[PDB]
Design goal:
The complex is a heterohexamer, with 3 copies of chain A (192 residues) and 3 copies of chain B (446 residues).
Chain A: H1 11-21, H2 26-44, H3 48-55, E1 56-67, E2 82-88, H4 90-101, E3 113-125, E4 132-145, E5 149-163, E6 169-177
Parallel strand pairs in A: 1-6
Antiparallel strand pairs in A: 1-2, 3-4, 4-5, 5-6
Helix pairs in contact in A: 2-3
Chain B: E1 15-17, H1 24-35, E2 40-44, E3 53-59, E4 62-68, E5 74-78, E6 93-95, E7 98-100, E8 107-109, E9 114-116, H2 120-123, E10 140-144, E11 147-151, H3 159-163, H4 166-176, E12 180-191, H5 196-204, H6 209-212, H7 214-220, E13 239-243, E14 249-253, H8 266-284, H9 286-292, E15 295-300, E16 304-307, E17 312-320, E18 323-333, H10 338-352, H11 357-371, E19 382-384, E20 393-394, E21 402-404, H12 411-424, H13 429-435, H14 439-444
Helix pairs in contact in B: 4-9, 5-12, 8-9
Bound molecules: 2,3-dihydro-1H-indene (3 copies), FE2/S2 (inorganic) cluster (3 copies) and fe (iii) ion (FE) (3 copies).
């Protein structure tokens, strides 16, 4: 990719493509698929503590941004381009997990139903840190509650995973640039 | 429905017909008597500081372009081309000297003037009177310490007068702190609630906090945490409630400067607010310096709300009777260290943004209360706001407005709905004033 | 539209304006004159048998809580908090001594009484009159052999009188069989049809079965299977149709005890019903014992339908003129072996549930017939229900009501729509009665 | 709103209230005064050439079956069963001698007659008057050179008279070319625009092309490409605009026979049209032979549009005030080589079909202009169509109708909206005629 | 997972997780993916007889339930928790297939269009029965008909597959707990 | 499949099934998955020129049809059964790419957001041409723009891929029979 020619492509997106187009290891894509499928399973059954214990690194940054709509030709206005829907460290994720599990979280009765669909998995080891695994994947997340409320979320996830305690690979960074500017899902209270 | 006669809000604001949260004809009527008549939040200086900077904003269901002029003023215009009515600007923010329509290419200035028309000489000759074809301008645009509001009605009171007695409470944080900045961009989420449901909640609802937010209080560790699950009532003198002639009101929780912020920010914030309070004692007196570092849950009538100290800033943009587009910004004090501003902004979104765990506690409450307003057996039912009635005062020597000297009550609901009913039944500002000449007496009866 | 004058249903129920399935203003009018006035199905004893057991149910577009009281009675209340109108109960069934609101924590008893208000002493003192703040109660709640119906109108006839001549046909299965149980939970699906489309279909439409359900008849092997693709008309004396003063009606297909159930259940069912019929001959006479084991397709006016023997039990819950939420339960005879009850319940859902292959045959029919009622050229067009007109009787020595002595006809449509029109044009029960004083004469003309 | 008095379109068609693109009550009124009154496009001979061939089509929000009769004529009927109102035909095209309803099996002929009723003898005896139960027939069905239009109003002018002065411009391509074929099936897409937004755009909007379609012009290489980004105005005498009494109008771009077609088709097309033009000079004269191979952007009032030469054929089917179902066909000349017809049809869809890159340039323009018509501050605002006013003529020696002798202007908007306003304020054709007796004088004022 | 700590997790869901977190065989996940992709292809083209012949075991239980919404803290009300939208043996599936293929099934003209998206495939052999293969997968099912009717279904499927005639692996149990309580899809007349 | 027995199955669909049910090469399905995931990534970041250069063969036919709704029993009416929403050669794709990248394409400001989900990948080498790879896959395509516009597309794709310049496998045919007759997505201006 040459972003002078491919006018619509951001520098960041071009950087990320480069990471996967190079060395391709089929075995790594396999491991990555297993890792994400198991993570999604834990989340779907609302095993949030198990998710934290098995899938989330102590040094995690879990970030979902919402980017302000600007002109494609904009080059002068330079104020904050995005806000953080999520920008959580491990302790902040733990707070959210406790909020989910609290028996006075009235919104969780009757019990919610989650179904996640993970696709387009790509994996590549980092150049500098041979212990850092880059994983890209897309998610459709279906949340149903209270008879007729149905919210479907769509996103691409840029992850970094690294082996932690026990040699278990855990999430150390997730970055999502949420594609819908105005949410039509009541909230974004789901772990993408 | 005859809005001149229909009692939608009972005397003294004691109850409201449940239909007000569900009736689409009333929603349409509110577009005229509420949103086209009153002051509505647009933006902050901090978001359009330089000439040419602009944002888009909603005013009711209308969309406007809000632009910093070369002379330093701000003007606002309908985001609608004067030719065949296409939406002029499709982005949320930027910098430009003008706006060109993507349909036939008419070019408008940042000042709203029709500046250019493609091939004007060949097509229109000298017959197009561009002077009469400027964008439809918002009649009134005023600032409250950097916070910019607009009003379509030239007859409105000045913004400062419109804030009435609420202004006195806002000034320590908005003015005497050295000034606030609004941190954008805002989160934006649609909820299936009437705009009045969150507006009333922020204006005067401390009662709900311990129960609605039990889980958020328990897991977050904020300073209001003792309230979780109604385990503990705040002590006497923990706060007060106020309301005003034009409907704005707020609750005051004394000393609650770290607000809803989780334990990770509490020490830093309590130190910062306390230090500034010590300086302010000498400038504005002990009571007002204390108010500066006290948590205010406020609605600026009709649909702009905030939690000072927590730093939550909300616009409840109306879509229809059961649909509202929620905009959430963070407010920070200009003289806070930049790293603290950044963490405060993230914390505002963490608690009250699109994935705000506090705000989520409120969803079912506001959505179902609104949607029940459409149900046949509930339309004519009475929503109650009588808590604390008969104990409110007016003209107090220390705290202005109609005031309930207790942290938890429904004083601010009553003032909000008194003003709402006065507007809905009136055709213009003069009629509102006539309907409001005994406003505080009505609120303090019994 | 003037509902006092507008002829929506022609004399003798012979035709109806197609707009009735599409007009939203009429739908709103039906909320008042149909749903707030008449008896609506709530639940069965079998679903709330113990003190504290409750379910939620719709009554029109309203939602109610239906609760077994300590004294063994059942009371029903609007599912709406008396404070700020939040929905009280968010689940479909359970057991509780009370319901606490998640907004400000008001606690209501199973008897609807406001029992507790958080911090009442500190906040309200002695000023809150909790005695006047009980949940809004459904005025009338009555039982027909365990089947519980509600009515918002205190002026309604007793449920038994309201069933009129239909009761005689229902009693052998509902009473003399030893009693029925309703098997929950129900299937729940939204269809894009007016509630009247399925109501009319179940009340009196045998004509459609051979053609609409050709594929289900052919592939399922049920006892009505000879009808597939209109290959064979039922013989003379294969059944009859009836209707009643308050609009309820049904078709009777003699001996069809295994109903729509596929061949896998036919021998067991035909044995069971036949054996019970032999016992009932001695108790209620041959004709009524035969009716017990005969397939009844019935609508209990306005929006509750059933297929006895097949065991299908339906509520057509209205949402708007082209939207209906279909609830499907199974009915079984209490003294059936448990394994047979289980297989019967599954078979009811297999044929008529959310994935019911029979029910699916009906979708396009009911959805398009309803949606066409909105189309400009069809609004004022006449839906026909004249089949069998001029051959109905009243006051027969054996079969009561207005009766057509043939299996296939539109007798029950005419009685359904006669009652519908009488309600839509009336302001109260007294006016309905005045409009209905010659009801059977009107139906048996010519 | 009082449609007899309300000025929705100002004198001479100079402006229109923006609400016309958003008001649902007006949309409902248009169903009566526009769609049930005027000629609407159904199909082409080429799509139903043989006896028994049929298609379904919309007429306003109604759906009709359009069928080739055995005698070679075409009749059209509401797609609604005369029994209980189910939709008769669920497919878009086919061949059949009749249509059987899937509800109770009533069988209707291709001629609309009720031919069979299942078990009629046993059920209805001799009492069913099938002669009175034929499908509701479209009163008027006429052809313009193979293009079939329908009208529900028996009082309408003949289709040829209704086309008025527009017919003269259409004839060289529709008649003298040897005839056109419509290539189906059409693309079908829903857009969130009022039907009038695309109708007005195709009837008279050349001004938008260079700017709206800048990207399509630049990347496609079509013959109109010089216009991209308003880089170049067409020369004087590049074309003209016309309008007519009953609202139809068009723009004429001289010689533009390859139209929007990308460079890959330009030489072949310019050769083909030029060759036919040379033959036509001798038959219809130089001016009309030139018109044959000139690009016409036309709307046949109310909601049928086309680009001749480009071969784009559109129906803007109304759904509600902000929803339109766009049908896109290709038109080709019968005597073109088959391979060229195929490539032309694909190119029509490539540019203006569901994934038409030209048509996509228009989406935001038409959707936002329509949706802004609902916004409170814009409802009473004036959409402008004054370009070229005061320079139009009538009764020209060469070019008939109200004509602006320039390629770019708003002549055709004015005539479109003059006719629209005359219909909206009239109860029947006689009233339209009375309201239109000085139609050309009104358009050529000043 | 410890369901005393992970308060939102059902005993059943915790049991199912345990099955896959243990022995992981990449080859088995491969076979499972092929099996489900081929099944979905047969269903999508409406080859219902071929589906029965090639994919469905004679001993099949094909079950989809709809669970009544109850309080998260409910512990006294013990009546039937769910109903069966489907609970079919082979003969009952055959009845439904014949109903689909019948030329008088008016709802099938014009022909329906199905598109299925299968993701999150997991596979593990049973402990006791070394011939029983557990497969878990999620489905998005898109059904389009009659111009503008569009229904999208979302579900997790707990399958058991076993080798049958010819050594071909066939479905012997499918269990779906449908996540939406009130269907907004006109019906559930699709094979999930 | 026997289409005399399986009444709902088209001859074309039966032909396509036959292609994959036979020889199964796990490695080929792997390569196909990589190929489609990379293509979808390039498209999602709007690297349209890179897509043409790396993914699209010079001899490509890129076709999406919309089929007219006809009676299942129809056998006499024989006019054009479908129209082409797309039927593009390489030059025509290039025109569409230039239209996307043009700075006067007003609809592309603010920048669109695309997310693609590719599933159900199947691959088989052609019988006659050992250099022609048949790939089948399903796509969910999510397009978000302008705050609250959200369009979701669903389709099955029948592809042929062949090695081109550099030995890189490129798309030489894509065929989609779009399953919704009337589009409810404003347009079909997306590369499926
Ligand atoms: C105190 C603290 C938080 C909140 C209020 C009052 C009203 C809304 C949210
Ligand atoms: C007999 C058998 C089945 C049904 C009826 C009559 C009416 C609806 C369904
Ligand atoms: C010339 C060329 C193209 C078009 C027009 C005029 C009106 C709509 C599209
Ligand atoms: S609509 Fe804006 S220039 Fe025409
Ligand atoms: S709304 Fe129920 S306690 Fe306030
Ligand atoms: S509705 Fe058509 S035959 Fe009855
Ligand atoms: Fe709250
Ligand atoms: Fe039926
Ligand atoms: Fe255009």
């Amino acid at each position: 990719i040459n972003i002078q020619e491919d006018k619509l492509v951001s520098a960041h997106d071009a950087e990320e493509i480069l990471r996967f187009f190079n060395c391709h290891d089929s075995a790594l894509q396999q491991e990555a698929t297993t890792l994400l499928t198991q993570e999604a399973h834990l989340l779907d059954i609302q095993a949030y503590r198990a998710w934290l214990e098995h899938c989330v690194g102590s040094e995690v940054q879990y970030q979902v941004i919402s980017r302000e709509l600007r002109a494609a030709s904009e080059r002068r206005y330079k104020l904050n381009e995005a806000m953080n829907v999520y920008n959580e460290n491990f302790q902040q994720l733990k707070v959210r997990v406790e909020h989910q599990l609290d028996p006075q979280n009235w919104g969780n009765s009757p019990k919610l139903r989650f179904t996640r669909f993970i696709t387009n998995v790509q994996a590549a080891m980092d150049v500098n840190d041979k212990e850092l695994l880059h994983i890209r994947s897309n998610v459709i997340l279906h949340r149903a509650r209270r008879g007729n409320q149905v919210d479907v979320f769509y996103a691409a996830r840029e992850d970094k995973w690294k082996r932690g305690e026990g040699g278990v690979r855990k999430l150390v960074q997730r970055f999502v640039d949420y594609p819908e500017r105005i949410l039509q899902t009541h909230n974004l209270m789901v772990f993408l | 429905m005859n809005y001149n006669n229909k009692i939608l809000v009972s005397e003294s604001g004691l109850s409201q017909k449940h239909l007000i949260h569900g009736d689409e004809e009333l929603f349409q009527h509110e577009l005229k008597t509420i949103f086209a008549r009153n002051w509505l939040f647009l933006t902050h200086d901090s978001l359009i500081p330089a000439p040419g900077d602009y944002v888009t904003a909603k005013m009711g269901i209308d969309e406007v372009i809000v632009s910093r002029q070369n002379d330093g003023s701000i003007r606002a215009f309908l985001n609608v081309c004067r030719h065949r009515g296409k939406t002029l600007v499709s982005v949320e923010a930027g910098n430009a000297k003008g706006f060109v329509c993507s349909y036939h290419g008419w070019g408008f200035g940042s000042n709203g003037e029709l500046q250019s028309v493609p091939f004007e000489k060949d097509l229109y000759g000298e017959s197009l009177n561009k002077k009469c074809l400027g964008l439809k301008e918002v009649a009134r645009v005023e600032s409250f310490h950097g916070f910019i509001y607009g009003c379509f009605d030239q007859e409105a009171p000045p913004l400062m007068d419109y804030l009435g007695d609420a202004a006195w409470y806002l000034e320590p944080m908005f003015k005497h702190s050295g000034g606030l900045e609004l941190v954008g961009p805002p989160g934006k989420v649609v909820i299936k609630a009437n705009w009045k449901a969150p507006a009333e909640n922020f204006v005067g609802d401390a009662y709900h906090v311990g129960w609605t937010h039990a889980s958020s209080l328990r897991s977050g560790e904020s300073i209001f945490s003792s309230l979780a699950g109604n385990a503990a009532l705040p002590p006497e003198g923990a706060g007060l409630q106020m309301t005003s002639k034009y409907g704005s009101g707020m609750g005051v929780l004394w000393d609650g400067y770290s607000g809803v912020h989780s334990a990770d920010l509490v020490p830093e914030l309590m130190a910062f607010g306390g230090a500034k309070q010590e300086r302010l004692n000498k400038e504005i007196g002990d009571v007002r310096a204390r108010i500066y570092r006290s948590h205010l849950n406020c609605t600026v009538f009709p649909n702009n709300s905030m939690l000072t100290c927590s730093g939550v800033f909300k616009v409840w943009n109306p879509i229809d009777a059961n649909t509202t587009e929620v905009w959430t910004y963070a407010i920070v004090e200009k003289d806070m260290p930049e790293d603290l501003k950044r963490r405060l902004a993230d914390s505002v979104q963490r608690t009250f943004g699109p994935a705000g765990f506090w705000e989520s506690d409120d969803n079912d409450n506001m959505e179902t209360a609104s949607q029940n307003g459409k149900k046949y057996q509930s339309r004519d039912s009475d929503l109650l706001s009588n808590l604390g009635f008969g104990e409110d005062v007016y003209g107090d020597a220390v705290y202005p407005g109609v005031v309930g000297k207790s942290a938890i009550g429904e004083t601010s609901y009553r003032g909000f709905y008194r003003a709402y009913q006065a507007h809905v039944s009136s055709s213009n500002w003069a009629e509102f004033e006539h309907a409001s000449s005994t406003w505080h007496t009505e609120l303090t009866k019994t």
